[PDB]
Motif scaffolding. Sequence first.
Motif, PDB file in Angstrom:
ATOM      1  N   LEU A 154       0.866  -1.209   0.000  1.00  0.00           N
ATOM      2  CA  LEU A 154       0.000   0.000   0.000  1.00  0.00           C
ATOM      3  C   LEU A 154       0.886   1.237   0.000  1.00  0.00           C
ATOM      4  O   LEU A 154       0.612   2.202  -0.683  1.00  0.00           O
ATOM      5  CB  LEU A 154      -0.897   0.001   1.239  1.00  0.00           C
ATOM      6  CG  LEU A 154      -1.717  -1.293   1.286  1.00  0.00           C
ATOM      7  CD1 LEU A 154      -2.683  -1.245   2.469  1.00  0.00           C
ATOM      8  CD2 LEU A 154      -2.514  -1.452  -0.010  1.00  0.00           C
ATOM      9  N   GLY A 155       1.985   1.191   0.705  1.00  0.00           N
ATOM     10  CA  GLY A 155       2.932   2.342   0.675  1.00  0.00           C
ATOM     11  C   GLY A 155       3.260   2.660  -0.784  1.00  0.00           C
ATOM     12  O   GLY A 155       3.129   3.785  -1.232  1.00  0.00           O
ATOM     13  N   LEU A 207      -0.245   6.093  -6.247  1.00  0.00           N
ATOM     14  CA  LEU A 207      -1.567   6.731  -6.443  1.00  0.00           C
ATOM     15  C   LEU A 207      -1.417   8.227  -6.205  1.00  0.00           C
ATOM     16  O   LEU A 207      -1.907   9.020  -6.969  1.00  0.00           O
ATOM     17  CB  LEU A 207      -2.594   6.119  -5.477  1.00  0.00           C
ATOM     18  CG  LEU A 207      -3.596   7.184  -5.004  1.00  0.00           C
ATOM     19  CD1 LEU A 207      -4.970   6.541  -4.799  1.00  0.00           C
ATOM     20  CD2 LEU A 207      -3.122   7.796  -3.679  1.00  0.00           C
ATOM     21  N   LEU A 208      -0.701   8.619  -5.187  1.00  0.00           N
ATOM     22  CA  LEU A 208      -0.487  10.076  -4.949  1.00  0.00           C
ATOM     23  C   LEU A 208      -0.063  10.748  -6.259  1.00  0.00           C
ATOM     24  O   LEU A 208      -0.220  11.943  -6.431  1.00  0.00           O
ATOM     25  CB  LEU A 208       0.607  10.277  -3.893  1.00  0.00           C
ATOM     26  CG  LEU A 208      -0.037  10.478  -2.518  1.00  0.00           C
ATOM     27  CD1 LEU A 208       0.934  10.034  -1.424  1.00  0.00           C
ATOM     28  CD2 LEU A 208      -0.366  11.958  -2.324  1.00  0.00           C
ATOM     29  N   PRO A 211      -8.179   9.851 -11.562  1.00  0.00           N
ATOM     30  CA  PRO A 211      -8.716  11.012 -12.316  1.00  0.00           C
ATOM     31  C   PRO A 211      -7.664  12.099 -12.554  1.00  0.00           C
ATOM     32  O   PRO A 211      -7.750  12.862 -13.495  1.00  0.00           O
ATOM     33  CB  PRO A 211      -9.840  11.543 -11.410  1.00  0.00           C
ATOM     34  CG  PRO A 211      -9.643  10.916 -10.054  1.00  0.00           C
ATOM     35  CD  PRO A 211      -8.398  10.024 -10.121  1.00  0.00           C
ATOM     36  N   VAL A 212      -6.726  12.233 -11.662  1.00  0.00           N
ATOM     37  CA  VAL A 212      -5.739  13.339 -11.780  1.00  0.00           C
ATOM     38  C   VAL A 212      -4.750  13.043 -12.908  1.00  0.00           C
ATOM     39  O   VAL A 212      -4.053  13.921 -13.354  1.00  0.00           O
ATOM     40  CB  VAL A 212      -4.984  13.502 -10.452  1.00  0.00           C
ATOM     41  CG1 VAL A 212      -4.617  14.975 -10.247  1.00  0.00           C
ATOM     42  CG2 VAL A 212      -5.868  13.043  -9.283  1.00  0.00           C
ATOM     43  N   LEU A 213      -4.688  11.830 -13.394  1.00  0.00           N
ATOM     44  CA  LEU A 213      -3.737  11.549 -14.514  1.00  0.00           C
ATOM     45  C   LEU A 213      -4.218  12.270 -15.773  1.00  0.00           C
ATOM     46  O   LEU A 213      -3.507  13.080 -16.340  1.00  0.00           O
ATOM     47  CB  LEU A 213      -3.620  10.040 -14.786  1.00  0.00           C
ATOM     48  CG  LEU A 213      -4.998   9.364 -14.775  1.00  0.00           C
ATOM     49  CD1 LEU A 213      -5.491   9.165 -16.212  1.00  0.00           C
ATOM     50  CD2 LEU A 213      -4.877   7.997 -14.099  1.00  0.00           C
ATOM     51  N   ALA A 214      -5.438  12.030 -16.180  1.00  0.00           N
ATOM     52  CA  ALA A 214      -5.981  12.756 -17.362  1.00  0.00           C
ATOM     53  C   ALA A 214      -5.823  14.254 -17.123  1.00  0.00           C
ATOM     54  O   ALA A 214      -5.436  14.999 -18.001  1.00  0.00           O
ATOM     55  CB  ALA A 214      -7.465  12.422 -17.545  1.00  0.00           C
ATOM     56  N   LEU A 215      -6.053  14.684 -15.918  1.00  0.00           N
ATOM     57  CA  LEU A 215      -5.839  16.116 -15.589  1.00  0.00           C
ATOM     58  C   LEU A 215      -4.339  16.394 -15.594  1.00  0.00           C
ATOM     59  O   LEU A 215      -3.865  17.248 -16.302  1.00  0.00           O
ATOM     60  CB  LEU A 215      -6.417  16.420 -14.201  1.00  0.00           C
ATOM     61  CG  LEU A 215      -7.857  16.928 -14.344  1.00  0.00           C
ATOM     62  CD1 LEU A 215      -8.727  15.844 -14.985  1.00  0.00           C
ATOM     63  CD2 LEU A 215      -8.418  17.280 -12.962  1.00  0.00           C
ATOM     64  N   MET A 216      -3.592  15.667 -14.816  1.00  0.00           N
ATOM     65  CA  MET A 216      -2.115  15.870 -14.768  1.00  0.00           C
ATOM     66  C   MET A 216      -1.574  16.081 -16.185  1.00  0.00           C
ATOM     67  O   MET A 216      -0.788  16.981 -16.431  1.00  0.00           O
ATOM     68  CB  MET A 216      -1.458  14.635 -14.133  1.00  0.00           C
ATOM     69  CG  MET A 216       0.070  14.730 -14.235  1.00  0.00           C
ATOM     70  SD  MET A 216       0.697  13.319 -15.183  1.00  0.00           S
ATOM     71  CE  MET A 216       1.503  12.452 -13.815  1.00  0.00           C
TER      72      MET A 216
END
Length: 33
Positions: free
Chosen positions: A8-9, A15-16, A21-26
Motif C-alpha cells: 500500500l505504501g 496513487l499520490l 482522475p488526476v492523470l488525465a488532468l495531470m
Amino acid sequence: DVRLAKTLGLVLAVLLICWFPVLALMAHSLATT
C-alpha cells in the motif's frame, strides 16, 4: 500499510501521483510540456 508497509505504501506513493482522475488532468492540469 495494513498488510505490511510497502504494497500500500507503493500504491499510496504511486496513487499520490497516479490515483485515477488526476492523470488525465495531470497530462493537462500539470502540463509537463
